[PDB]
Amino acid sequence: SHSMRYFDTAVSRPGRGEPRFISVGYVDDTQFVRFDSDAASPRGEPRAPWVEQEGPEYWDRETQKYKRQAQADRVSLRNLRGYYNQSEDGSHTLQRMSGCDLGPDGRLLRGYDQSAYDGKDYIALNEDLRSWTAADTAAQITQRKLEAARAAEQLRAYLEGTCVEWLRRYLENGKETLQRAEPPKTHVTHHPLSDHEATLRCWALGFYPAEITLTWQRDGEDQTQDTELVETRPAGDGTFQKWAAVVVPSGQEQRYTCHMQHEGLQEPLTLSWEPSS
Amino acid sequence: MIQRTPKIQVYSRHPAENGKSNFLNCYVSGFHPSDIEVDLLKNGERIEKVEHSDLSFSKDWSFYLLYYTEFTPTEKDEYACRVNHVTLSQPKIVKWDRDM
Amino acid sequence: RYRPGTVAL
Amino acid sequence: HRKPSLLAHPGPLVKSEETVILQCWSDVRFQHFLLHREGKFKDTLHLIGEHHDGVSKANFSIGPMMQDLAGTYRCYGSPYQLSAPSDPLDIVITGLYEKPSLSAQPGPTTLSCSSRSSYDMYHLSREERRFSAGPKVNGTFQADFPLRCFGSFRDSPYEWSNSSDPL
């Protein structure tokens, strides 16, 4: 089971030029493409080697789509400023998620084209790829225009056809990096907090994909209600990191174990703080 | 109009070994809108060559970014990340604890 | 492969 | 300081991507021409003056016709001193939605333009005139002209839907 998603951000900047349109593309947790309407010569660029060998005819087409989308999102920002009766002097954000989810069989699991306005859900293509769901009465106007323009047909065809095909191709051409397990490297660190307290931090480093779970357990008790869990970080090289900390009484840490389930493993790992001596 | 404050994480790509090369990372996530000011600090002094990822966001529509730089850590060298955002009245300083 | 163009919102 | 003529070639109603030309001219010999669009996206363009047969003309190429290029245009004919604004020219983009259907009662040669896409307005032309739709019982929306058609939405009366069946 895999995924391909495009994330778009259009931000209006009234007195300082056209709205900035940024679009990034992902296969699962791996970015492969990028577009920035503020670059010197705005062009869709590759960000993963398994799209660098696509012809210039590919990148020219993608770039044309991106420029047109920048214009259409400028227009959309204007229209939504109108719909909500908002001033022409504020900065507003329009976001989009589009793309296809592939089941374990490779067939289309789910087609997505959803849009948020100022971080709030605005309008979403429904799973039948034939109807829309509008969050308020301004989005109903957008729904009527979308319907009259047969937008769900073009989108339904992109999602059912081009999206799934090219995701299959991306997945094969980068079968190694993309379909590899890649489990996390682990260890447990000990840090003196104060008299009668000290922190145990459990590390998971260098893993792909990003989905992972670590939990601290004292002997049996599940201290998630007391565990400090940071959100999963990018290490910077396409892999991910995470840690979980628990505050414990000094000299009582052997009761604690870190339990770690991830894709690149079978047996969920259980590791404890081990001083070397 | 919804506004979310950023969560900030200062960390190196790999566990710091003195004299060995590494990447200093500041990860900002969960914020809205996308306008954000992030700088890295050596001795509380700003750092020139600081690259950042392309602006992307999460399924709840909040944005995230990775600002990073090359560095080689020292016992006595110190590093921080400063973040300013409309949700904040004064920028947050978050120092690089190599144990976090 | 990016999605195809649509009318504005 | 005499208002010029603004003429849309080959007409005021443009289809998407189709470059259309706005001609501004007068027997008054300004060496500068300023074209102003009011509407969704206000804008102002500068062409320098052309002189031919006693008329100063100016051919404003407005390019691949997009939504942001529809609106109401005037032009003004010494860079600072400008003329009185020309008569207004409503320039619309067409080609965005599904075209409607034209029934008539009774004769073929009380019209009607129909679609179940709930347009807010409808329009006409020959080689204009408008009316806003009113819904009904079978799930359709309707307007009819007492006596070529287009649809449009209330917030954008310059973005029209597709050249319907001729008649």
Q: What is the DSSP string of A168-193?
A: HHHHHHTHHHHS---PPEEEEEEEEE
Cβ contact A22–B54 (<8 Å): yes
Cβ contact C7–A146 (<8 Å): yes
Q: Mutate which of A231, A237, A246 to test chain B, going by most B C-beta atoms within 10 A?
A: A231
Q: Are A50 and A32 in contact (CB under 8 A)?
A: yes
Residue of B nearest to A91 (CA): B33
Do A100 and A221 have their domain in common?
no
Q: Enter the tokens of residue A10.
A: 């259009």
Do A79 and A106 have their domain in common?
yes
Backbone angles phi, psi at A266, to 5 degrees: -110, -65
> D35 to chain A nearest CA, in Å?
20
Q: Enter the tokens of residue B48.
A: 């020139």
Q: Are A27 and A178 in contact (CB under 8 A)?
A: yes
The number of domains in chain A is: 2
- Which chain A residues have a beta carbon less than 8 Å from that of C7? 72, 145-146, 149, 151
B71 at interface of A, judged by CB pairs closer than 8 A: no
Known binding site: residues of A? 62, 69, 76, 158, 170
Between chain A and chain C, how many beta carbons pairs sit less than 8 Å apart?
A: 57
Looking at the domain assignment, is residue A67 inside a domain?
A: yes
- Which chain D residues have a beta carbon less than 8 Å from that of C7? 67, 96-97
Looking at the domain assignment, is residue A252 inside a domain?
A: yes
Do A223 and A196 have their domain in common?
yes
The separation between CA A178 and the C-alpha centre of its own chain, rounded to angstroms, equals 15
- Resolution of the entry in angstroms: 2.5
Residue of C nearest to A73 (CA): C8
Cα distances from A158 to residues A112, A129, B28, B63, D148, in angstroms, run: 11, 10, 33, 26, 32
Looking at the domain assignment, is residue A276 inside a domain?
A: no
Do A156 and A255 have their domain in common?
no
Chains B and C touch (3+ CB pairs under 8 A): no
D82 at interface of C, judged by CB pairs closer than 8 A: no
Q: Are A156 and A130 in contact (CB under 8 A)?
A: yes
- Please give the Cα distance from A21 to D48 (Å, whole number): 33
Domains of chain D: 5-93 (2.60.40.10), 94-161 (2.60.40.10)
Looking at the domain assignment, is residue A224 inside a domain?
A: yes
Domain stop point among A180, A206, A231: A180
Do A72 and A105 have their domain in common?
yes
**Identity of residue D146:** P
Q: Are D143 and D114 in contact (CB under 8 A)?
A: no
Between chain A and chain D, how many beta carbons pairs sit less than 8 Å apart?
A: 35
- Please give the Cα distance from A221 to A248 (Å, whole number): 13
Looking at the domain assignment, is residue A91 inside a domain?
A: yes
Q: Are B11 and A233 in contact (CB under 8 A)?
A: yes
- Count of Cβ atoms closer than 10 Å to residue D98 Cβ: 17
Q: Are D162 and D94 in contact (CB under 8 A)?
A: yes
- Please give the Cα distance from D18 to D21 (Å, whole number): 10
Q: Mutate which of D38, D41, D68 to test chain A, going by most A C-beta atoms within 10 A?
A: D68
- Count of Cβ atoms closer than 10 Å to residue A226 Cβ: 13
Do A12 and A97 have their domain in common?
yes
Touching partners of D (3+ C-beta pairs < 8 Å): A, C
Do A74 and A97 have their domain in common?
yes
**Identity of residue B19:** G
By Cβ distance, the residue of B34, B53, B99 closest to A93 is B34
DSSP A95: E
- Please give the Cα distance from A242 to A202 (Å, whole number): 8
By Cβ distance, the residue of A78, A145, A150 closest to D40 is A78
- The residues on C that touch D, with CB distances below 8 Å, are 7-8
Do A189 and A147 have their domain in common?
no
Cβ contact C9–A79 (<8 Å): yes
Could you list the residue range(s) of the whole structural domain that residue A240 is in?
A: 181-271
Do A249 and A147 have their domain in common?
no
